[PDB]
Amino acid sequence: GNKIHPIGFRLGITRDWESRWYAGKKQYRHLLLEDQRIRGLLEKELYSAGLARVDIERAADNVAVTVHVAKPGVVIGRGGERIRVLREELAKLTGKNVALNVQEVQNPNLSAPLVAQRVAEQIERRFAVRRAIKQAVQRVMESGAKGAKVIVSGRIGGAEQARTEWAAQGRVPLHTLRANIDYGFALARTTYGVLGVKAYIFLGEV
Amino acid sequence: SKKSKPGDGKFGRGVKRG
Amino acid sequence: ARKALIEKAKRTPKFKVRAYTRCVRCGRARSVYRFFGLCRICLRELAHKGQLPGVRKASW
Amino acid sequence: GKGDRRTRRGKIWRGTYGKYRPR
Amino acid sequence: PRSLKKGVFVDDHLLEKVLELNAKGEKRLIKTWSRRSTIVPEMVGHTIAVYNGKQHVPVYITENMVGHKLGEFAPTRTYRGHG
RNA sequence: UGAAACUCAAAGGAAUUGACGGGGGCCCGCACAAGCGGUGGAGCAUGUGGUUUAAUUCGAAGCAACGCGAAGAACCUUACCAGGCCUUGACAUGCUAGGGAACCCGGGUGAAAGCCUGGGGUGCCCCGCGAGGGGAGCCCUAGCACAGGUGCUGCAUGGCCGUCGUCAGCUCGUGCCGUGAGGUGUUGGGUUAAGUCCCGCAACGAGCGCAACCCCCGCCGUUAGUUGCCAGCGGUUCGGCCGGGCACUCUAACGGGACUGCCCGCGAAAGCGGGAGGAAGGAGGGGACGACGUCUGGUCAGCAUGGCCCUUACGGCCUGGGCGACACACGUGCUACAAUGCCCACUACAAAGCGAUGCCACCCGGCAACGGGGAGCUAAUCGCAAAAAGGUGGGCCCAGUUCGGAUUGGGGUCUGCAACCCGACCCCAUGAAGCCGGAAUCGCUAGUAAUCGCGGAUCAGCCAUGCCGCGGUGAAUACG
Ligand SMILES: [Mg+2]
Ligand SMILES: [Mg+2]
Ligand SMILES: [Mg+2]
Ligand SMILES: [Mg+2]
Ligand SMILES: [Mg+2]
Ligand SMILES: [Mg+2]
Ligand SMILES: [Mg+2]
Ligand SMILES: [Mg+2]
Ligand SMILES: [Mg+2]
Ligand SMILES: [Mg+2]
Ligand SMILES: [Mg+2]
Ligand SMILES: [Mg+2]
Ligand SMILES: [Mg+2]
Ligand SMILES: [Mg+2]
Ligand SMILES: [Mg+2]
Ligand SMILES: [Mg+2]
Ligand SMILES: [Mg+2]
Ligand SMILES: [Mg+2]
Ligand SMILES: [Mg+2]
Ligand SMILES: [Mg+2]
Ligand SMILES: [Mg+2]
Ligand SMILES: [Mg+2]
Ligand SMILES: [Mg+2]
Ligand SMILES: [Mg+2]
Ligand SMILES: [Mg+2]
Ligand SMILES: [Mg+2]
Ligand SMILES: [Mg+2]
Ligand SMILES: [Mg+2]
Ligand SMILES: [Mg+2]
Ligand SMILES: [Mg+2]
Ligand SMILES: [Mg+2]
Ligand SMILES: [Mg+2]
Ligand SMILES: [Mg+2]
Ligand SMILES: [Mg+2]
Ligand SMILES: [Mg+2]
Ligand SMILES: [Mg+2]
Ligand SMILES: [Mg+2]
Ligand SMILES: [Mg+2]
Ligand SMILES: [Mg+2]
Ligand SMILES: [Mg+2]
Ligand SMILES: [Mg+2]
Ligand SMILES: [Mg+2]
Ligand SMILES: [Mg+2]
Ligand SMILES: [Mg+2]
Ligand SMILES: [Mg+2]
Ligand SMILES: [Mg+2]
Ligand SMILES: [Mg+2]
Ligand SMILES: [Mg+2]
Ligand SMILES: [Mg+2]
Ligand SMILES: [Mg+2]
Ligand SMILES: [Mg+2]
Ligand SMILES: [Mg+2]
Ligand SMILES: [Mg+2]
Ligand SMILES: [Zn+2]
């Protein structure tokens, strides 16, 4: 086991944090807890919408959560009435005025977190794990991506002897910092144990 | 015949009690 | 001995000296950083996601 | 030597002060 | 050792058990878990059953064992050698 | 000449990819050599084996386990042991029933936990000049669904990490070769730190790697000028202190600068030797970055997670004990054995960090650890702070010593509910082994090794001599 997380490797160069705020030594952590707590709520509730990235912005006693969901209609609800039921339920733990934006997804087949979640879904749904890899990587490249790689690990097909299966198209320069590589992870639960789904999309260099 | 290692002679179980 | 010790560290104790940190993410008793309220592992996990304001893999 | 608490040397080592190394 | 600016330590619940006994014409056999308690001159001539983690070791108390904690007289490791 | 009983599920031929060779060739790495300091002996610190124990919780196992998980075990931690206790439970949601509570002050007992307990007084929308009965944050007694499990399987798993190895390699698409595995390309000449690049070629391209983009350090510019700086004039209790000023130093963002660009020489080319300008030259020093894979490598005890298992107990609370045991054995370290040294006084020069139940100036008490007072600092301002080796001066005179500071007696300080097991520190006294370490054995190629001190994470305190950093001083040697 060797390889560095490609997003933590690009923080400051190609990648921005999921939380933007200064806070001092005396209350940084307490903001971090809410931050982690917030995302829990929304990954727990807005998973069905195709959640991709929870950006959390803070100025002072007013917090600015920003969801990046594939189908935002599943978030807003009856014309702002689902968004409301959580724009409120957020303040129920927030304590601050929890201003909640929903942002469109440019192309879901270009959001590594989603590709993962969808392959993870398919293998949770008893499809051929080898097929799903070669299919996801196909869909990504059709979408103009300059390279894409998917990786499955665990008891594929419930085979006792765990295994690792992957497939890759285009190019994925992991050692390059100027390469924009969306990386997401999904976790696939089954009756026989757990499998890990890793998705790498080369979006292009800068 | 209880929790962890060493074993108490029953399969799987050890000597430590709660 | 996990969950009942997650709770117990929260409880305010019979004595000041019995206070101790735990990771608020995973429950770890050891290697808990005060600044984050996090063990050294969860620290490295949340960091690499960029879910930690301003934190960046140092180098020099 | 550094193991000698009773010298200016041993207090520099154990990072303490006293008669044998005041401040 | 304990800062003499502060007290001389006895859990206050073992001391009470003694003074009472002193009053009514002692001695009952005193059992307690306060190994950290000091041997105090009021105790001399009682016998305090001290806990060694497993048993209450019975300890007679004489004028010359007064500066000490009671735990000093009920050891906790049973060793008896190698061989 | 030439059988059989009996017995096996193979015995074989060629060729393929590997791996291996006390086969070959060509390369390389503190691999050896050349050197410099150490380990192996001593005493002690810590980890481990073994043993012991009521328990000495559990894991890591050659390199790559052994100051490793442990970036802080007196209680807590704690997963172990003894004993005293709880049973929808310390925690989650949800269904009832009876109180109808919410929450803050008590008390009897007991080591505490617990068991028994005693006070006051709740809105919510209501029919209210009413008796007041509902309903409802959320509490409680019983009853359920369920919680709980650091119990097992790392040989069912995800994730993360170790490692070979920053080694130069691993492949693919189409074409070609072969019945086929497979081959070619990736081999060959030259080159490079490099499957780096050149030339050659039944191959032509392409991907993962190498390099590059990122960070620190080295020179210069711009932009800034307080809390930082003081070149030159004005004051000055002589402190950049005040006037002023941002030149410089610095601080922290944005740039420039090195590319074999130029000259000579070799060469088919790539490059290679040397030269000049230049702060810096052949990748300028250092870091971050770790290929396809390997090892049924490590982790079910961080977490996640399938299956197995426990249910007044393999769960949970408590007090005490243990994790600190000691005929022994190993590992990683600290301090030394002394004069290129030790000691006292005096006096210089860092860098990086930390600091509002914190850092503590300074002042008095105390031989001191400390205590009491007590300014400033939300900190380029105030503090931790003194750096230490160094330099000056004095003392020791080759001695188990003015070397060494282990062990033990006594007397204190502080943190802490509490230092018996089992804390650190201070002062008096004590003053062990050790005279440079058997067989054997480790690290380092330059601001390196060696030597000197400083800081931080954890943290009440601390068993840190550990770890991660920081600058001071600054070598030896590499033929091959
Ligand atoms: Mg089943
Ligand atoms: Mg054992
Ligand atoms: Mg047995
Ligand atoms: Mg238990
Ligand atoms: Mg503690
Ligand atoms: Mg902690
Ligand atoms: Mg053959
Ligand atoms: Mg050598
Ligand atoms: Mg030695
Ligand atoms: Mg030794
Ligand atoms: Mg053992
Ligand atoms: Mg062990
Ligand atoms: Mg285990
Ligand atoms: Mg420690
Ligand atoms: Mg306990
Ligand atoms: Mg304990
Ligand atoms: Mg394994
Ligand atoms: Mg694994
Ligand atoms: Mg194992
Ligand atoms: Mg190879
Ligand atoms: Mg082909
Ligand atoms: Mg053919
Ligand atoms: Mg082929
Ligand atoms: Mg090859
Ligand atoms: Mg090859
Ligand atoms: Mg080949
Ligand atoms: Mg060949
Ligand atoms: Mg290389
Ligand atoms: Mg070729
Ligand atoms: Mg600098
Ligand atoms: Mg200027
Ligand atoms: Mg690289
Ligand atoms: Mg194994
Ligand atoms: Mg687990
Ligand atoms: Mg499991
Ligand atoms: Mg230990
Ligand atoms: Mg030895
Ligand atoms: Mg050590
Ligand atoms: Mg040693
Ligand atoms: Mg300090
Ligand atoms: Mg002597
Ligand atoms: Mg001798
Ligand atoms: Mg002497
Ligand atoms: Mg001396
Ligand atoms: Mg003493
Ligand atoms: Mg102690
Ligand atoms: Mg001598
Ligand atoms: Mg030597
Ligand atoms: Mg080298
Ligand atoms: Mg020295
Ligand atoms: Mg230190
Ligand atoms: Mg500390
Ligand atoms: Mg000790
Ligand atoms: Zn954690």
GROMACS .gro file of N, CA and C (backbone and C1' of nucleotides) in nm, chain A residues 1-4 9 13 25 149 153-155 160-163 166 170-178 185 187 189-196 198, chain F residues 156-166 207-214 288-297 304-307 354-356 379:
model
  367
    1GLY      N    1   0.079  -0.123   0.000
    1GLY     CA    2   0.000   0.000   0.000
    1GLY      C    3   0.082   0.129   0.000
    2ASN      N    4   0.070   0.207  -0.107
    2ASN     CA    5   0.169   0.312  -0.124
    2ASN      C    6   0.113   0.450  -0.155
    3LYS      N    7   0.007   0.460  -0.235
    3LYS     CA    8  -0.018   0.581  -0.313
    3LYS      C    9  -0.085   0.693  -0.232
    4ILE      N   10  -0.044   0.817  -0.260
    4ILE     CA   11  -0.098   0.934  -0.192
    4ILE      C   12  -0.234   0.971  -0.250
    9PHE      N   13  -0.308   1.590  -0.216
    9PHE     CA   14  -0.181   1.617  -0.281
    9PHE      C   15  -0.187   1.744  -0.366
   13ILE      N   16  -0.323   2.394  -0.533
   13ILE     CA   17  -0.270   2.399  -0.668
   13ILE      C   18  -0.385   2.379  -0.764
   25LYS      N   19  -0.724   2.934   1.741
   25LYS     CA   20  -0.694   2.815   1.819
   25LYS      C   21  -0.805   2.784   1.920
  149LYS      N   22  -0.997   0.626  -1.475
  149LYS     CA   23  -0.952   0.503  -1.413
  149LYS      C   24  -1.045   0.466  -1.298
  153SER      N   25  -1.203  -0.338  -0.516
  153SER     CA   26  -1.130  -0.425  -0.426
  153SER      C   27  -1.228  -0.484  -0.327
  154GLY      N   28  -1.202  -0.610  -0.289
  154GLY     CA   29  -1.278  -0.686  -0.193
  154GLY      C   30  -1.314  -0.821  -0.253
  155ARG      N   31  -1.424  -0.877  -0.205
  155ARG     CA   32  -1.468  -1.010  -0.248
  155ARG      C   33  -1.559  -0.995  -0.369
  160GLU      N   34  -1.436  -1.603  -0.228
  160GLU     CA   35  -1.369  -1.609  -0.099
  160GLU      C   36  -1.237  -1.535  -0.102
  161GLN      N   37  -1.156  -1.564  -0.202
  161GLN     CA   38  -1.026  -1.502  -0.220
  161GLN      C   39  -1.047  -1.361  -0.275
  162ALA      N   40  -1.034  -1.261  -0.188
  162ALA     CA   41  -1.051  -1.123  -0.230
  162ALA      C   42  -0.955  -1.091  -0.343
  163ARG      N   43  -0.992  -0.988  -0.419
  163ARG     CA   44  -0.924  -0.953  -0.543
  163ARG      C   45  -0.931  -0.802  -0.565
  166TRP      N   46  -0.941  -0.348  -1.196
  166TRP     CA   47  -0.946  -0.212  -1.246
  166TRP      C   48  -0.937  -0.211  -1.398
  170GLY      N   49  -0.747   0.659  -2.167
  170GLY     CA   50  -0.684   0.789  -2.175
  170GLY      C   51  -0.554   0.790  -2.096
  171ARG      N   52  -0.541   0.887  -2.006
  171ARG     CA   53  -0.420   0.898  -1.927
  171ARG      C   54  -0.454   0.965  -1.796
  172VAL      N   55  -0.384   0.923  -1.691
  172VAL     CA   56  -0.402   0.970  -1.554
  172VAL      C   57  -0.266   0.997  -1.490
  173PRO      N   58  -0.205   1.115  -1.513
  173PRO     CA   59  -0.074   1.150  -1.454
  173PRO      C   60  -0.083   1.187  -1.307
  174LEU      N   61  -0.082   1.082  -1.224
  174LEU     CA   62  -0.096   1.098  -1.079
  174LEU      C   63   0.023   1.172  -1.018
  175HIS      N   64   0.140   1.164  -1.081
  175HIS     CA   65   0.259   1.232  -1.032
  175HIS      C   66   0.266   1.377  -1.075
  176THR      N   67   0.167   1.424  -1.150
  176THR     CA   68   0.162   1.561  -1.199
  176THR      C   69   0.069   1.643  -1.111
  177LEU      N   70   0.115   1.761  -1.069
  177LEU     CA   71   0.025   1.843  -0.990
  177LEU      C   72  -0.067   1.927  -1.077
  178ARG      N   73  -0.017   1.980  -1.189
  178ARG     CA   74  -0.101   2.061  -1.278
  178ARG      C   75  -0.211   1.981  -1.346
  185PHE      N   76  -1.442   0.849  -0.385
  185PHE     CA   77  -1.449   0.712  -0.335
  185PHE      C   78  -1.593   0.678  -0.301
  187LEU      N   79  -1.818   0.328  -0.116
  187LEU     CA   80  -1.806   0.204  -0.041
  187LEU      C   81  -1.927   0.116  -0.069
  189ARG      N   82  -2.145  -0.202   0.015
  189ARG     CA   83  -2.184  -0.305   0.111
  189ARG      C   84  -2.262  -0.414   0.039
  190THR      N   85  -2.237  -0.539   0.078
  190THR     CA   86  -2.306  -0.655   0.021
  190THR      C   87  -2.334  -0.756   0.132
  191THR      N   88  -2.392  -0.869   0.093
  191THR     CA   89  -2.420  -0.973   0.191
  191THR      C   90  -2.294  -1.044   0.238
  192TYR      N   91  -2.186  -1.036   0.160
  192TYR     CA   92  -2.064  -1.111   0.189
  192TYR      C   93  -1.952  -1.025   0.248
  193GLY      N   94  -1.975  -0.895   0.268
  193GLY     CA   95  -1.871  -0.805   0.313
  193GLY      C   96  -1.867  -0.681   0.227
  194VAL      N   97  -1.756  -0.609   0.235
  194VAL     CA   98  -1.751  -0.473   0.183
  194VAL      C   99  -1.647  -0.464   0.072
  195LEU      N  100  -1.674  -0.374  -0.025
  195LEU     CA  101  -1.589  -0.350  -0.140
  195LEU      C  102  -1.567  -0.200  -0.159
  196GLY      N  103  -1.447  -0.162  -0.203
  196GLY     CA  104  -1.408  -0.022  -0.217
  196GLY      C  105  -1.395   0.020  -0.362
  198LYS      N  106  -1.301   0.321  -0.634
  198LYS     CA  107  -1.219   0.439  -0.653
  198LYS      C  108  -1.227   0.481  -0.799
  546A        P  109  -0.982  -1.472   0.742
  546A      O5'  110  -1.005  -1.443   0.588
  546A      C5'  111  -1.043  -1.548   0.501
  546A      C4'  112  -1.159  -1.508   0.414
  546A      C3'  113  -1.145  -1.376   0.342
  546A      O3'  114  -1.062  -1.386   0.230
  546A      C1'  115  -1.359  -1.389   0.439
  547U        P  116  -0.968  -1.262   0.193
  547U      O5'  117  -1.072  -1.141   0.198
  547U      C5'  118  -1.036  -1.009   0.240
  547U      C4'  119  -1.154  -0.914   0.230
  547U      C3'  120  -1.120  -0.766   0.227
  547U      O3'  121  -1.088  -0.723   0.098
  547U      C1'  122  -1.293  -0.804   0.383
  548G        P  123  -0.988  -0.601   0.078
  548G      O5'  124  -1.078  -0.471   0.104
  548G      C5'  125  -1.175  -0.423   0.011
  548G      C4'  126  -1.240  -0.297   0.062
  548G      C3'  127  -1.149  -0.176   0.075
  548G      O3'  128  -1.140  -0.103  -0.045
  548G      C1'  129  -1.271  -0.203   0.275
  549G        P  130  -1.000  -0.039  -0.090
  549G      O5'  131  -0.960   0.059   0.030
  549G      C5'  132  -1.031   0.180   0.049
  549G      C4'  133  -1.006   0.243   0.184
  549G      C3'  134  -0.863   0.278   0.218
  549G      O3'  135  -0.822   0.398   0.159
  549G      C1'  136  -0.963   0.172   0.402
  550C        P  137  -0.686   0.399   0.077
  550C      O5'  138  -0.578   0.412   0.193
  550C      C5'  139  -0.588   0.517   0.286
  550C      C4'  140  -0.506   0.491   0.409
  550C      C3'  141  -0.363   0.445   0.386
  550C      O3'  142  -0.274   0.551   0.357
  550C      C1'  143  -0.465   0.308   0.547
  551C        P  144  -0.143   0.523   0.268
  551C      O5'  145  -0.051   0.438   0.364
  551C      C5'  146  -0.002   0.495   0.483
  551C      C4'  147   0.068   0.393   0.568
  551C      C3'  148   0.187   0.323   0.505
  551C      O3'  149   0.304   0.403   0.507
  551C      C1'  150   0.051   0.163   0.610
  552G        P  151   0.428   0.365   0.413
  552G      O5'  152   0.478   0.225   0.470
  552G      C5'  153   0.551   0.216   0.591
  552G      C4'  154   0.595   0.074   0.620
  552G      C3'  155   0.696   0.012   0.524
  552G      O3'  156   0.829   0.050   0.555
  552G      C1'  157   0.520  -0.140   0.561
  553U        P  158   0.929   0.111   0.445
  553U      O5'  159   0.986  -0.017   0.369
  553U      C5'  160   1.006  -0.140   0.437
  553U      C4'  161   0.997  -0.256   0.342
  553U      C3'  162   1.052  -0.228   0.204
  553U      O3'  163   1.193  -0.242   0.201
  553U      C1'  164   0.845  -0.343   0.188
  554C        P  165   1.282  -0.149   0.108
  554C      O5'  166   1.315  -0.240  -0.017
  554C      C5'  167   1.365  -0.372   0.000
  554C      C4'  168   1.328  -0.459  -0.116
  554C      C3'  169   1.359  -0.399  -0.251
  554C      O3'  170   1.489  -0.433  -0.291
  554C      C1'  171   1.137  -0.479  -0.248
  555G        P  172   1.565  -0.339  -0.395
  555G      O5'  173   1.547  -0.195  -0.332
  555G      C5'  174   1.611  -0.083  -0.391
  555G      C4'  175   1.515   0.032  -0.411
  555G      C3'  176   1.443   0.083  -0.287
  555G      O3'  177   1.426   0.222  -0.307
  555G      C1'  178   1.285   0.027  -0.449
  556U        P  179   1.431   0.326  -0.186
  556U      O5'  180   1.351   0.452  -0.244
  556U      C5'  181   1.415   0.560  -0.312
  556U      C4'  182   1.411   0.543  -0.462
  556U      C3'  183   1.505   0.634  -0.540
  556U      O3'  184   1.556   0.560  -0.649
  556U      C1'  185   1.288   0.658  -0.624
  597G        P  186   0.055   0.889  -2.435
  597G      O5'  187   0.013   0.775  -2.332
  597G      C5'  188  -0.115   0.777  -2.270
  597G      C4'  189  -0.132   0.664  -2.172
  597G      C3'  190  -0.050   0.671  -2.044
  597G      O3'  191  -0.102   0.759  -1.945
  597G      C1'  192  -0.032   0.454  -2.135
  598C        P  193  -0.003   0.829  -1.839
  598C      O5'  194   0.033   0.714  -1.735
  598C      C5'  195  -0.068   0.652  -1.657
  598C      C4'  196  -0.013   0.532  -1.582
  598C      C3'  197   0.107   0.560  -1.493
  598C      O3'  198   0.072   0.616  -1.368
  598C      C1'  199   0.150   0.370  -1.623
  599G        P  200   0.148   0.748  -1.317
  599G      O5'  201   0.285   0.693  -1.257
  599G      C5'  202   0.411   0.741  -1.300
  599G      C4'  203   0.515   0.632  -1.291
  599G      C3'  204   0.659   0.677  -1.279
  599G      O3'  205   0.695   0.720  -1.149
  599G      C1'  206   0.645   0.508  -1.442
  600C        P  207   0.763   0.864  -1.125
  600C      O5'  208   0.887   0.865  -1.225
  600C      C5'  209   1.000   0.784  -1.197
  600C      C4'  210   1.119   0.827  -1.278
  600C      C3'  211   1.145   0.976  -1.285
  600C      O3'  212   1.208   1.028  -1.169
  600C      C1'  213   1.157   0.884  -1.501
  601A        P  214   1.155   1.166  -1.101
  601A      O5'  215   1.187   1.276  -1.212
  601A      C5'  216   1.321   1.304  -1.252
  601A      C4'  217   1.327   1.392  -1.377
  601A      C3'  218   1.252   1.525  -1.373
  601A      O3'  219   1.325   1.631  -1.313
  601A      C1'  220   1.192   1.410  -1.567
  602A        P  221   1.251   1.732  -1.211
  602A      O5'  222   1.150   1.817  -1.301
  602A      C5'  223   1.189   1.898  -1.412
  602A      C4'  224   1.066   1.954  -1.481
  602A      C3'  225   0.962   2.018  -1.389
  602A      O3'  226   0.989   2.154  -1.363
  602A      C1'  227   0.856   1.862  -1.533
  603C        P  228   0.974   2.214  -1.214
  603C      O5'  229   0.821   2.255  -1.205
  603C      C5'  230   0.766   2.342  -1.303
  603C      C4'  231   0.617   2.325  -1.314
  603C      C3'  232   0.541   2.341  -1.184
  603C      O3'  233   0.517   2.477  -1.150
  603C      C1'  234   0.466   2.148  -1.298
  604C        P  235   0.596   2.548  -1.028
  604C      O5'  236   0.540   2.475  -0.898
  604C      C5'  237   0.406   2.492  -0.858
  604C      C4'  238   0.378   2.425  -0.725
  604C      C3'  239   0.473   2.458  -0.611
  604C      O3'  240   0.449   2.583  -0.550
  604C      C1'  241   0.446   2.226  -0.621
  678A        P  242   1.016   1.399   0.184
  678A      O5'  243   0.897   1.470   0.106
  678A      C5'  244   0.790   1.529   0.177
  678A      C4'  245   0.688   1.585   0.082
  678A      C3'  246   0.625   1.483  -0.010
  678A      O3'  247   0.512   1.419   0.048
  678A      C1'  248   0.705   1.664  -0.138
  679C        P  249   0.493   1.260   0.031
  679C      O5'  250   0.496   1.234  -0.127
  679C      C5'  251   0.390   1.279  -0.210
  679C      C4'  252   0.423   1.268  -0.357
  679C      C3'  253   0.452   1.129  -0.409
  679C      O3'  254   0.334   1.053  -0.428
  679C      C1'  255   0.605   1.283  -0.503
  680G        P  256   0.324   0.908  -0.362
  680G      O5'  257   0.442   0.828  -0.434
  680G      C5'  258   0.442   0.812  -0.576
  680G      C4'  259   0.511   0.685  -0.620
  680G      C3'  260   0.446   0.556  -0.570
  680G      O3'  261   0.484   0.450  -0.659
  680G      C1'  262   0.660   0.578  -0.474
  681A        P  263   0.410   0.307  -0.657
  681A      O5'  264   0.393   0.276  -0.811
  681A      C5'  265   0.309   0.356  -0.892
  681A      C4'  266   0.331   0.319  -1.035
  681A      C3'  267   0.288   0.177  -1.070
  681A      O3'  268   0.155   0.175  -1.116
  681A      C1'  269   0.510   0.216  -1.146
  682C        P  270   0.041   0.105  -1.030
  682C      O5'  271   0.034  -0.044  -1.087
  682C      C5'  272  -0.022  -0.073  -1.213
  682C      C4'  273   0.039  -0.198  -1.274
  682C      C3'  274   0.025  -0.327  -1.195
  682C      O3'  275  -0.102  -0.388  -1.211
  682C      C1'  276   0.246  -0.306  -1.277
  683G        P  277  -0.180  -0.446  -1.083
  683G      O5'  278  -0.097  -0.576  -1.048
  683G      C5'  279  -0.043  -0.596  -0.919
  683G      C4'  280   0.094  -0.658  -0.929
  683G      C3'  281   0.149  -0.726  -0.804
  683G      O3'  282   0.098  -0.858  -0.785
  683G      C1'  283   0.312  -0.583  -0.893
  684U        P  284   0.051  -0.906  -0.638
  684U      O5'  285   0.184  -0.957  -0.565
  684U      C5'  286   0.278  -1.039  -0.632
  684U      C4'  287   0.411  -1.038  -0.561
  684U      C3'  288   0.409  -1.076  -0.414
  684U      O3'  289   0.415  -1.218  -0.399
  684U      C1'  290   0.544  -0.881  -0.448
  685C        P  291   0.294  -1.303  -0.337
  685C      O5'  292   0.332  -1.314  -0.182
  685C      C5'  293   0.460  -1.358  -0.143
  685C      C4'  294   0.513  -1.279  -0.028
  685C      C3'  295   0.426  -1.272   0.096
  685C      O3'  296   0.451  -1.380   0.185
  685C      C1'  297   0.512  -1.056   0.042
  686U        P  298   0.365  -1.516   0.193
  686U      O5'  299   0.220  -1.482   0.138
  686U      C5'  300   0.109  -1.567   0.161
  686U      C4'  301  -0.015  -1.484   0.172
  686U      C3'  302  -0.057  -1.442   0.314
  686U      O3'  303  -0.088  -1.302   0.315
  686U      C1'  304  -0.240  -1.531   0.197
  687G        P  305  -0.042  -1.211   0.439
  687G      O5'  306   0.103  -1.158   0.398
  687G      C5'  307   0.220  -1.212   0.457
  687G      C4'  308   0.304  -1.105   0.523
  687G      C3'  309   0.233  -1.025   0.632
  687G      O3'  310   0.235  -1.091   0.758
  687G      C1'  311   0.340  -0.877   0.480
  694A        P  312  -1.643   0.135   1.347
  694A      O5'  313  -1.698   0.112   1.199
  694A      C5'  314  -1.718   0.221   1.111
  694A      C4'  315  -1.698   0.179   0.969
  694A      C3'  316  -1.757   0.043   0.936
  694A      O3'  317  -1.892   0.054   0.899
  694A      C1'  318  -1.533   0.052   0.862
  695U        P  319  -1.999  -0.030   0.980
  695U      O5'  320  -1.976  -0.178   0.925
  695U      C5'  321  -1.993  -0.203   0.786
  695U      C4'  322  -1.910  -0.319   0.734
  695U      C3'  323  -1.935  -0.455   0.795
  695U      O3'  324  -2.055  -0.511   0.746
  695U      C1'  325  -1.703  -0.423   0.760
  696G        P  326  -2.148  -0.598   0.841
  696G      O5'  327  -2.136  -0.746   0.781
  696G      C5'  328  -2.164  -0.772   0.644
  696G      C4'  329  -2.118  -0.910   0.598
  696G      C3'  330  -2.148  -1.028   0.689
  696G      O3'  331  -2.282  -1.072   0.678
  696G      C1'  332  -1.924  -1.043   0.614
  697G        P  333  -2.352  -1.146   0.802
  697G      O5'  334  -2.258  -1.267   0.835
  697G      C5'  335  -2.268  -1.387   0.760
  697G      C4'  336  -2.166  -1.486   0.807
  697G      C3'  337  -2.177  -1.529   0.953
  697G      O3'  338  -2.279  -1.624   0.981
  697G      C1'  339  -1.956  -1.470   0.909
  744C        P  340   0.350   2.762   1.675
  744C      O5'  341   0.346   2.768   1.834
  744C      C5'  342   0.343   2.648   1.908
  744C      C4'  343   0.342   2.672   2.057
  744C      C3'  344   0.246   2.778   2.109
  744C      O3'  345   0.114   2.730   2.122
  744C      C1'  346   0.456   2.808   2.210
  745G        P  347  -0.007   2.835   2.134
  745G      O5'  348   0.026   2.920   2.264
  745G      C5'  349  -0.004   2.872   2.394
  745G      C4'  350   0.038   2.973   2.498
  745G      C3'  351  -0.044   3.101   2.502
  745G      O3'  352  -0.165   3.087   2.573
  745G      C1'  353   0.185   3.154   2.511
  746A        P  354  -0.303   3.127   2.501
  746A      O5'  355  -0.370   3.225   2.605
  746A      C5'  356  -0.510   3.220   2.628
  746A      C4'  357  -0.544   3.250   2.772
  746A      C3'  358  -0.691   3.273   2.797
  746A      O3'  359  -0.727   3.216   2.924
  746A      C1'  360  -0.567   3.478   2.832
  769A        P  361  -0.298   3.892   1.828
  769A      O5'  362  -0.142   3.917   1.851
  769A      C5'  363  -0.090   4.048   1.868
  769A      C4'  364   0.040   4.045   1.942
  769A      C3'  365   0.144   3.953   1.881
  769A      O3'  366   0.224   4.022   1.787
  769A      C1'  367   0.128   3.916   2.117
   0.00000   0.00000   0.00000
